[PDB]
Structures are given as C-alpha cells and as structure tokens.
Ligand binder design. Sequence first.
Ligand SMILES: [Ca+2]
Ligand SMILES: [Cl-]
Ligand SMILES: [Cl-]
Ligand SMILES: [Cl-]
Length: 305
Amino acid sequence: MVPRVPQPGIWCPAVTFFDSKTDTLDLASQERYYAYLARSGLTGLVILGTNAEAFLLTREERAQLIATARKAVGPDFPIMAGVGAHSTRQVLEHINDASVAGANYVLVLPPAYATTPPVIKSFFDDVSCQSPLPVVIYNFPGIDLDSDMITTIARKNPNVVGVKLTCASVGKITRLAATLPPAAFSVFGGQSDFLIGGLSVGSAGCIAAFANVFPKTVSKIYELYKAGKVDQAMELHRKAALAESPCGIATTKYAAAIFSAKAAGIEDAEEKLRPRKPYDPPSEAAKQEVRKVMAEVAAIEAGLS
Ligand SMILES: [Ca+2]
Ligand SMILES: [Cl-]
Ligand SMILES: [Cl-]
Ligand SMILES: [Cl-]
C-alpha cells in the first residue's frame, strides 16, 4: 500500500495527450504512456502538474486523467495529483474529485489571483483540515513561500506531508530538514540539475520534467546515488543535465513525443503531444535542437531499457 507520507525517490510530472482533430483527451494513448513511465524505475507519478497543462483542462478532464493514471499503474504505485486553482472552493472540488478518482496525495499551489501571508496561511490551514488526502505544498513562484511559512504550515497541519520546491536551493532544503523530520514530511526539488546537491543534503528527491523523456536514465541517476556509487552517478547526471537544456512545455511534450512516447508504442505521438489549442507547437529549429542535444542520452536510455 502507498504510505501517508510520499516516498523519497524520482517522480515524473506526466505530459498530456490530445486528439488534435477533436481537442479531447486521448485516454488510450495516455494510459499506454503512464503505464510505460511507471514501469521505468520511477517512484511515483505526478498527474496534473504544470507539465500536464492542468490549467487548460476542464474539471471532468482532470478527473479522467487521474482515473486513467490509477488504471495504468495499479493500486500499489503512488499518484500525486495537482489540484491548484484560484479559490478554496475550486481546490476542494478538485481534491474531492482526485480522491474519488484514486489519487494518494494532492499537490496544492498557494492561492494566486500575489496574495498576502495570513491569506496563504489560512488557505493551507483550511485545505489540510478539509482534505481527504494528504497534502503537498506546491511552491511555484505568483507568491514564493520561504522556509518560515512552510514550517509554520506543516507544524500546524499533520495532514501536510511535504513541499515541492521548484527552484530548490541547498540552503532551503537544509533549513527544512533541520525543522521537519523526514518521517512526517518529504521535501522535493523540481530540478534534476539540483538533485546532485539536492539529495546529498537529504531531500526526499525530485519531481523531474525530464523523466518524461528518459525515465530509466533519470531513475538510474537516483539509483546510483542511493547505492553510494557516486562517481558514475555524477558522470551520468552530467550528461543528463546537458541534455535537459531545452526549456518550456511545448519543447518537453515534443521530446516525450519522439523519445518516451515512441518507446511506449504510441503512434503519431508528435501530433498528440501538441500543446492544447490555441497554443502553438515548437518551431522546426527548436525541434532540430531537441534531436541533436538529446541524441547521446537517447543512446544511453536505449542501453538501459
Ligand atoms: Ca534497448
Ligand atoms: Cl483508457
Ligand atoms: Cl510507434
Ligand atoms: Cl528505450
């Protein structure tokens, strides 16, 4: 069974497939893709993160994706669902939808419509208390939450079980560790390129966009660190950080289309991984860059899977 407090490890915030002719979710492809990712050494999936274009989805689509995730991975693989919105009412509706659809945890943005600090504090208090699922603070700056607010929120709310920091520092991680024991609270960095130092000071690890593209490689990096084989870990980490260069959403979707989605046997992956209307796909030149810059890590991934 999935623990109350999210397991340290490597998590992937999965991209979203759209049938472009009808502008609807492509759930058959989505299920194939989620299942492939969960079978590539990942600790868990983040569904409806920012990479999934969650804010472009209807409430019903959000719930279908969570349910599709659960079906793809089975009952023993952790799912963290993004639920962020503008009001407490919307957040609670998303949370309850997530709970019914099978999520284990909910990942919650602070309210943004730049809000004040007692507003942030009372929001998280109200949300943790009402939420049927354990809560991970989603810090994506839009306001930025320092160590003081996070610790305050966590100490008052035992249903708060972690934080995703998007731009995590070694200082920030350390401060959190010193005040919040790991058994009750998991810190996640959002950067694969942070994870070298990220884990060396006791993060719970990482929620990495790039694990969409080469999940086995990103998991190998983590696995080598936990084995103490720190020499080859850093050498592989280096290569992977190099390949991660291209960054936002449209480029990531396209990389997944030509690497992981193809590996998952999804046909026409490139059309299905266009950004949702009316947003445009990457330029030809952006696409050429992806293929050149990621070719080496692709060969490594074909070697590990
Ligand atoms: Ca192979
Ligand atoms: Cl399905
Ligand atoms: Cl194919
Ligand atoms: Cl492969």
